[PDB]
Amino acid sequence: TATYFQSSDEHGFSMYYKPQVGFVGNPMPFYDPVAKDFKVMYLQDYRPNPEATYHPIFGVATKDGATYESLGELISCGGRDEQDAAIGTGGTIYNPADKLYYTFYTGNKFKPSSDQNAQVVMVATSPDFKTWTKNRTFYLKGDTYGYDKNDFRDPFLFQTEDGVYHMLIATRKNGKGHIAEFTSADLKEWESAGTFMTMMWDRFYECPDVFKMGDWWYLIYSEQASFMRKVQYFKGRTLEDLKATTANDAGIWPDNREGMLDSRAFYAGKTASDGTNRYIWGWCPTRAGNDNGNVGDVEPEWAGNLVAQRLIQHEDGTLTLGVPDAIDRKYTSAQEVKVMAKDGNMIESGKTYTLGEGASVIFNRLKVHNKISFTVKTASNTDRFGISFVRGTDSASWYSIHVNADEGKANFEKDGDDAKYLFDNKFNIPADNEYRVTIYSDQSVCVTYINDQLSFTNRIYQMQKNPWSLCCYKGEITVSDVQVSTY
Numbered sequence: 077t078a079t080y081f082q083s084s085d086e087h088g089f090s091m092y093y094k095p096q097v098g099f100v101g102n103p104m105p106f107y108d109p110v111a112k113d114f115k116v117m118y119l120q121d122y123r124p125n126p127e128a129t130y131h132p133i134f135g136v137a138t139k140d141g142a143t144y145e146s147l148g149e150l151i152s153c154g155g156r157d158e159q160d161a162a163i164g165t166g167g168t169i170y171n172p173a174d175k176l177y178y179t180f181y182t183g184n185k186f187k188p189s190s191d192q193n194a195q196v197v198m199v200a201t202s203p204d205f206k207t208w209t210k211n212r213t214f215y216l217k218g219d220t221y222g223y224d225k226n227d228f229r230d231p232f233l234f235q236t237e238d239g240v241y242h243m244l245i246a247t248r249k250n251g252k253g254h255i256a257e258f259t260s261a262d263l264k265e266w267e268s269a270g271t272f273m274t275m276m277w278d279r280f281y282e283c284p285d286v287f288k289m290g291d292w293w294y295l296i297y298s299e300q301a302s303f304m305r306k307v308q309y310f311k312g313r314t315l316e317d318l319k320a321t322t323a324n325d326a327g328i329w330p331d332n333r334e335g336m337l338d339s340r341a342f343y344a345g346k347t348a349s350d351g352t353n354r355y356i357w358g359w360c361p362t363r364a365g366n367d368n369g370n371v372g373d374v375e376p377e378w379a380g381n382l383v384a385q386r387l388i389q390h391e392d393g394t395l396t397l398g399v400p401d402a403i404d405r406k407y408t409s410a411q412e413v414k415v416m417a418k419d420g421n422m423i424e425s426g427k428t429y430t431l432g433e434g435a436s437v438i439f440n441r442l443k444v445h446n447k448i449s450f451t452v453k454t455a456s457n458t459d460r461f462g463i464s465f466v467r468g469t470d471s472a473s474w475y476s477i478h479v480n481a482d483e484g485k486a487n488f489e490k491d492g493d494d495a496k497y498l499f500d501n502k503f504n505i506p507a508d509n510e511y512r513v514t515i516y517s518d519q520s521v522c523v524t525y526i527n528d529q530l531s532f533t534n535r536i537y538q539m540q541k542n543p544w545s546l547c548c549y550k551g552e553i554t555v556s557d558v559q560v561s562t563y
């Protein structure tokens with residue numbers, strides 16, 4: 077049938093990774109140049125978390141962002157009264173001069189006095205990536221360098237070609253967000269290089285990531301402002317050009333969409349390259365009560381599932397995200413696609429489905445891990461269509477990605493009874509009115525890609541073992557080459 081089925085997630089997820097117990101918080105992806113794979117450290121979340129001692133650094137190893145090997149607890153929390161009672165994001169770099177991996181991280185003091193440092197940068201090292209030893213005498217306090225006591229976090233490490241090691245830290249100075257820069261020859265002694273970049277207006281850029289790709293420098297960041305809660309970027313041809321983008325609040329956006337790569341269900345994205353591709357790892361939030369339409373009052377829930385995406389550098393230097401090749405390759409097993417119900421102005425005709433305003437088609441029940449592809453041609457570039465999940469023939473409500481060409485964005489919405497707008501994802505509308513759609517799912521987590529322009533991560537509890545649907549809200553669409561593969 078095509079009746080709504082009360083499906084449920086497994087404890088663990090293997091592709092949009094989640095451990096058996098707990099959730100994936102801020103990722104710390106690192107290409108390990110000795111093992112020649114990615115070590116994705118991440119902040120381990122539980123429900124509930126201890127009050128004082130939470131968010132230890134766990135790890136998974138992956139070659140390709142599709143299959144993961146669990147590494148367990150790597151850098152554990154300090155004691156209740158220590159500066160790193162709770163751990164926040166940082167960054168890793170391998171030093172071949174002593175053959176040690178250095179992971180810098182944020183030590184979060186439990187209930188600091190007004191004079192204590194809530195947030196301090198600390199470090200641990202490892203020869204093998206298995207046993208980590210804290211440097212119990214290393215503390216980098218923002219305070220000391222005229223930066224903030226309480227917001228001083230998310231250290232990002234990279235080495236420029238001159239061999240100098242750089243550390244960028246999200247902080248504040250003089251009532252404004254500053255990415256602070258520190259330098260070192262050896263990773264042990266550090267000097268202030270002043271402010272790398274100011275943060276636009278009263279925004280705050282969490283989880284900064286600076287890298288060179290082809291002939292452009294990029295800053296990728298996660299915006300803490302409650303109205304945004306998305307992963308954004310800036311670009312520049314030189315390092316100095318990059319830094320200038322936010323100088324005096326210049327606001328030199330890299331593209332026509334303020335460098336917004338994804339929406340509010342992909343956060344804390346940070347990147348790593350194997351020399352062939354650069355991937356980004358972020359998390360897709362959980363929802364309270366498993367309710368796809370409870371996306372938080374001000375901010376979503378923190379942590380959920382690991383989501384890997386692939387950076388696409390366009391030839392004007394702009395970035396979009398597409399699927400990792402190895403994720404796509406996992407979907408080997410073709411499923412039959414059959415119409416289960418029709419409504420309104422809707423025509424099936426061989427393997428082509430045409431829909432006008434108000435019309436919908438419901439297809440057969442998905443499996444657990446799904447790849448859904450189809451081409452959508454619209455009549456005009458003011459038209460609007462819907463990609464709907466958890467839509468049984470008896471569902472009063474369901475969850476849809478609205479592609480509104482007139483508004484130049486996709487939305488995620490609750491449709492049906494108790495319909496409501498949730499959030500959006502601006503992308504480049506095709507000139508030829510043609511949308512090549514791919515959707516990859518692992519249980520309740522999916523990313524929708526269109527034309528190498530849109531990358532839209534969503535949390536959709538119960539999309540698995542439930543029917544899906546296409547609809548037209550405005551104008552007319554014709555739909556072709558509908559496939560579903562699974563694994």
Ligand SMILES: OC[C@H]1O[C@](CO)(OC[C@H]2O[C@@](CO)(OC[C@H]3O[C@](O)(CO)[C@@H](O)[C@@H]3O)[C@@H](O)[C@@H]2O)[C@@H](O)[C@@H]1O
Nearest residue numbers: 121125131162163164165182184229230282283344378
């Ligand atoms: O938000 C739910 C989450 O809240 C607690 C609440 O006390 O967590 C967020 C706190 O986690 C800390 C310490 O590990 O680190 C947060 C990192 O998250 C970012 O903000 C990105 O989202 C990054 O900039 C930080 O390094 C601390 O800073 C927060 O207060 C937990 O109980 C629960 O998991």
Ligand SMILES: OC[C@H]1O[C@](CO)(OC[C@H]2O[C@@](CO)(OC[C@H]3O[C@](O)(CO)[C@@H](O)[C@@H]3O)[C@@H](O)[C@@H]2O)[C@@H](O)[C@@H]1O
Nearest residue numbers: 480483485487489490494495496497498499500501502
């Ligand atoms: O289910 C109905 C739904 O509509 C409401 C109220 O009208 O709101 C949002 C709708 O507005 C649209 C734009 O026409 O967009 C979002 C705008 O806001 C931004 O996200 C931030 O500034 C921007 O990118 C857009 O301009 C439309 O697509 C939505 O349908 C909800 O109250 C109600 O639940």
Ligand SMILES: OC[C@H]1O[C@@](CO)(OC[C@H]2O[C@](O)(CO)[C@@H](O)[C@@H]2O)[C@@H](O)[C@@H]1O
Nearest residue numbers: 276277278279280301302303304334500
């Ligand atoms: O839903 C809010 C909506 O407003 C936008 C429009 O640019 O931005 C304005 C935003 O920028 C500041 O000036 C800087 O902090 C804020 O004070 C203000 O709210 C969109 O980007 C956003 O989606």
